[PDB]
DNA sequence: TTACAATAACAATA
DNA sequence: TGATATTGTTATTGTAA
DNA sequence: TTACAATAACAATA
DNA sequence: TGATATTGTTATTGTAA
């Protein structure tokens, strides 16, 4: 197995950081680069274990959550420099107890949400705003609108989504499009990786598609296209965050602040409300439209966040 | 740690089998008894490993599912004879691959059900039959009726359920009772073990309660009360199975045969349809009424089996 | 002696 | 069933001034 | 040379 | 996150006959 290599992306990041004139020092990326370098020429498992142990020692005061993320960064770096068969991958791991606890925390949060759904009282207004965004000349605005209307993830919409018209007999679907470019997935059976699949839309599909090509043909849309996730975050995350804060500050439910992924939650809640066939559970429908693996009903649980006021009324009406 | 002991329940079962005049020979219980006996005086892990390995060798041609169950029987026997701290418990285990595969199979089945819910067209009739059973003089019939009306498990209803009236301000709830005696659970936080908790009922609570005391005061109801699960199965399972087959043969959906647990599925579907408050998900509501652990939304997935025809209609009515 | 924008760390969610 | 890829939030850095 | 009831094995589900 | 407790189905046994 390779006893030498470099994590190219990390060092490119550091080298780009060499010319900043503002901002935090890239301490973490640095530690990761040093780590990978020190690893060069290492052959003994106890040496590897020692090195990792020092790294884990440094991460001490961080949040459990932060530590899991960081561990992912180191593991991806090792994997990039030395490949998949490097014994350090058996060693640079988190404790099972830590992963287990993260899971417990998460499921508890979700359970808490399921017993106290937030009533999205002004959701029609939110969707209206998103429809209006589809006509803006600012491609960020169009992007947001497309989030609301298609429920695609921001990274998907801005960097890789392929929206297409969807058939319906001999005609074209008014309320559904074809989508390719599912993120957070990898090649496999039952996976939507590189799969084109049909998704409902919350305004006319023509409108959506037109707004999309306008996004893709713009200047900023040309930068965005095919970008990596790190690049995407750096270029757009804070601006998108702020714009969304502002756009929905008045209409969003009081229980939470307006965030981009909010739109993906609402979308699922709205599409189910409007389009769900009768022989299918809410879990199944959500998993279907959100691009989840074939037999995964559990990720859908994360998205049951809101109650639409019509349903709140109707349920209250008994008795 | 104890190097000696006996699995009393197993040998009592064998000794009761000594006087049968009909039926299969208790091969399995026998092998388990011999196993436990051979274990007496054992001190060396390789000897233990060998013994287990022979047992696992015998179980070869059985179904994965059967093998997991059998392994539970051996483990419970070891645990009963020698206690919880016996090193054989580290050895008499199934493979991780086997448990993982069982899980995959299960989730796939559930996923398949969620994308093809069975329309329970005649469910009003089924519930009616169950209401009628509450007036029968045959306590089995009453029991069935109470399954349909309370969604409690058969073992719970026949052997240990404690039904009680539920308050509602200064009055008494018309559509909910108090229940104690949750099975398939053990002492813990967030658990319903020995907890009295409120559950909806699908006919008037008075009716339900009256039918219950009639069940409890009967002769067969006196046998049933406080019985073990093995005793319960042996005494009642095949008769209950047959009676249920017969009672619902004409009205049950064509996609499946009428089984007692069917009534627990339908119950949950009906109660949600009628009683579910607006700020709660179907998963949460099911987990609440079915007695599931506090942060467990996943077991609820097993119960989404049917679509009530009203919902099928209403969903079909768009567009 | 503060503003401010820019950056990556830190952190949560799916 | 081993341990990721997105989204979301804040402390630090450098610079005008 | 079969019926039949009884039993526990075998098996799936939650 | 280690490995159970219920519910559901069928093959074997013994007995009349
Ligand atoms: C823990 C966890 C893992 N995963 C995936 C990412 C990897 O495939 C693997 C890592 O754990 O599981 C999720 O998608 N969500 C989660 O909450
Ligand atoms: C695999 C599995 C386990 N369990 C419980 C029983 C034990 O507490 C433990 C055994 O695995 O998990 C279930 O309730 N359902 C399942 O499907």
Numbering used by the authors:
A (entry chain A), B (entry chain A): 103 to 421
The authors write:
Hairpin telomeres of bacterial linear chromosomes are generated by a DNA cutting–rejoining enzyme protelomerase. The protelomerase enzymes function as a dimer, making staggered cleavages of both strands of DNA to form covalent 3′-phosphotyrosine linkages, then exchanging the released 5′-ends while holding onto the 3′-ends, and finally sealing the broken DNA strands to generate two hairpin ends.
To better understand how protelomerase functions, we have crystallized the full-length protelomerase from the plant pathogen Agrobacterium tumefaciens C58 (TelA) in complex with DNA substrates containing the terminal sequences of the Agrobacterium linear chromosome. Phases for a parental TelA–DNA complex were obtained by the selenomethionine SAD phasing method, and all crystal structures have been refined to 2.2∼2.4 Å resolution. In the crystals, the asymmetric unit contains a single TelA molecule bound to a hairpin telomere sequence, and the crystallographic dyad generates the TelA homodimer responsible for resolution of a replicated hairpin telomere. Our models consist of residues 102 to 421 of the full-length 442 residues TelA protein bound to a half-site DNA substrate consisting of a 13 or 14 bp double-stranded stem and a 5′-overhang. The electron density for the N-terminal ∼100 residues was very weak, likely reflecting high flexibility.
